[PDB]
Structure 1
Amino acid sequence: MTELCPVYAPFFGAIGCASAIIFTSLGAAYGTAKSGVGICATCVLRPDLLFKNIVPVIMAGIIAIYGLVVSVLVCYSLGQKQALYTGFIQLGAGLSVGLSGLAAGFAIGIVGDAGVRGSSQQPRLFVGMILILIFAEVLGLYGLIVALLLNSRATQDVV
């Protein structure tokens, strides 16, 4: 238990990995929930459109994959002799990644449900729904980039 590296140093690294995985998974699951509700609603009307309307599910899966990748990158930096600062940095990175994942999940789910309903009502809005989905996913990419930068900060030199 050093001055800057107590025994509980790996604690926050492990917790950050756990958060970056779990919260991103929760957000992706909520988005997939909304997307699946919308797809099952639309397929009863325009199956040739709904079958192609699975894109928001792919976006939610991408959010989940980004969260898992962030968690995996966090796992490399974990260690017992590892310092307490980099442990907190991993914890903060995980928290930021998970919160961004939740945000992107809710936004993408709502946007995808609305877009699939519109596409069933009017095919002209398919491109608009795709664009809204991409813009929402930009937030998830922002969160992933921030988490990667924070993890690299943790992996840098420490006491």
Structure 2
Amino acid sequence: NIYAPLYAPFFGFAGCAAAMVLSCLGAAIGTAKSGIGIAGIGTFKPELIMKSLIPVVMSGILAIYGLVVAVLIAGNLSPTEDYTLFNGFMHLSCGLCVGFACLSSGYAIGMVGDVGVRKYMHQPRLFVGIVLILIFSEVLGLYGMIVALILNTRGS
């Protein structure tokens, strides 16, 4: 079969790896850079820490976004079934458009939710705006996951 060559799972497992590595990279930037800002206010008003763990949770959801598409790419890969190069390019693209989506969303959550938590010890009215900017910066990875799911269902 000229449409299903034997090097096609290379681009599917590359889609798995780009969906997992870059999304957990974004999740790790988003949890580490924000945990810096949460622990920075550890002494000055310690009672605002357990309320401020939201940019850590919203960063950890970005790894679930990559986990879902990595499971759904790895479920379409078998050495006995035929696997087109179209399918491999499509899995490469759907991992690649969720990995950098979650990477950018994790950079945005990490840069927002430590400055916000670090200024939140002065003004206690910041929290609604902080959560709102975190929602706007966390739907960035949801957009990429939507594109990845539509692209996975299209390419198979």
> What range describes the TM-score normalised by the shorter chain of this pair?
over 0.9
The DSSP-based 3-state class of the residue aligned with 1:43 is coil
Larger displacement relative to structure 2 (83-92 or 69-78):
69-78
Match of 1:89 in 2: 90
- Residue 7 of structure 1 and its aligned partner are, at CA, apart by 0.6
CA RMSD of aligned residues (A): 0.9
The CA distance in 2 between the partners of 1:72 and 1:9, in whole Å, is: 18
Name the amino acid aligned to 1:69: V
- Residue 50 of structure 1 and its aligned partner are, at CA, apart by 1.5
Name the amino acid aligned to 2:149: L
- TM-score with structure 2 setting the length: 0.95
Match of 2:55 in 1: 56
Q: How does 1:142-157 map to 2 (within 5 A)?
A: 142-155=143-156
The CA distance in 1 between the partners of 2:135 and 2:95, in whole Å, is: 23
- TM-score with structure 1 setting the length: 0.94
Higher helix share: 1
Match of 1:107 in 2: 108
Match of 1:16 in 2: 15
- Residue 79 of structure 1 and its aligned partner are, at CA, apart by 2.9
Q: Deviations over 1:87-117 (max 9, x none)?
A: 1100000000001010000000011011101
Name the amino acid aligned to 2:73: V
Query: Mind listing any 5+ residue stretches in structure 1 that lack a counterpart?
Result: none
Match of 2:46 in 1: 47
Residues 77 and 154 of structure 1 are in contact (CA less than 8 Å); yes or no, is this contact kept in structure 2? no
Match of 1:124 in 2: 125
The CA distance in 2 between the partners of 1:64 and 1:101, in whole Å, is: 8
The CA distance in 1 between the partners of 2:154 and 2:51, in whole Å, is: 41
The CA distance in 1 between the partners of 2:132 and 2:113, in whole Å, is: 11
Match of 2:66 in 1: 67
Q: Deviations over 1:7-53 (max 9, x none)?
A: 10111111101110010000110111111101100121121111210
The DSSP-based 3-state class of the residue aligned with 1:115 is helix
Query: Mind listing any 5+ residue stretches in structure 2 that lack a counterpart?
Result: none
Give the aligned length: 154
The CA distance in 1 between the partners of 2:154 and 2:78, in whole Å, is: 15
